[PDB]
Amino acid sequence: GAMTIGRAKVYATLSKIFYHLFYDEAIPKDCREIIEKFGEIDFNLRSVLVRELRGSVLIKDMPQSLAEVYESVMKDFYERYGFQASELHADHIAVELAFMSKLVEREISLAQQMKEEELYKIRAAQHRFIKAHLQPLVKNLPSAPLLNFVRDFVREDAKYLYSSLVGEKNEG
Amino acid sequence: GAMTIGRAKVYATLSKIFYHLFYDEAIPKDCREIIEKFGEIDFNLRSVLVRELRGSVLIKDMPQSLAEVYESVMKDFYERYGFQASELHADHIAVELAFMSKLVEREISLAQQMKEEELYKIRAAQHRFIKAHLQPLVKNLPSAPLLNFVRDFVREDAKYLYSSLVGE
């Protein structure tokens, strides 16, 4: 329904925004309006910052030796769900957001098909991905209006996904 | 047939009973008879108790901070199958039972129409709903005759659905 359609739209729009900002392109009206529906915001970030918004960079706690294989970890997750690499590093926030959008789009299709067991698997994957990769990246974002919106959106989306799963997890 | 008709009836009747109790209303004779066909049961539960029979309240590892998004989870599941929550919270037991009744009614229709692909999907949806939402809710109900009846009915129904689905 509208709620899940909105999840996909926000992930897709945020990803498109970060691709534009990576190249110092203006944010188009359609993208701006989708995000501005939630409150006043600006998109005034420069490529010099946006290029560095990668998990292996932002997560300062990551052991160096594992930072060196993290893109491989990302790619295997992506490949397992048919998601293609772009020209950006696999751990870049634009790419991680695009991956979530693809997962939610898959969920939408499975919902329309009433494929409940497969939908469950894709929702589980969304949770796994948000817990392993995207939330750790976003929790280490520096403060700015757009980035703070992403923090809030991802925090609430993580809560939604976890709440979906917690009951069955604890059934014995 | 009779088995599936019976499943739909029990879910619908339990839902109706919980609505009456929520609203401090007497349980009508038709509802009582349906449930008591399985043995004597007392239907005395105070409205304040019944109002709190929500998945977000009952599921122990769900903190209160997740109750609002959990309502969204419930409504998302409902919408996929053309069901709307009522004026009650979407995670209230009365609503969850009503949703099961609607899924069983759809199963009955699909079986009459020999729509096999869709029938299987709907049965799988019932089982998923029980596993994900209704069984976790009923697990932590207080002990009382009606609550024990529902817990046991749901547990047996889950086993039936799982068995029916594993062959296939």
From Swiss-Prot, chain A:
The keyword Chaperone applies. Transmembrane segments: none annotated. GO terms for cellular component: cytoplasm. Keywords: Chaperone, Cytoplasm. It is found in: Cytoplasm. Disulfide bonds: none annotated. It comes from the Archaea. Belongs to the TorD/DmsD family. Binds specifically to the Tat signal peptide of the TtrA subunit of the tetrathionate reductase. Monomer. This is Tat proofreading chaperone TtrD.
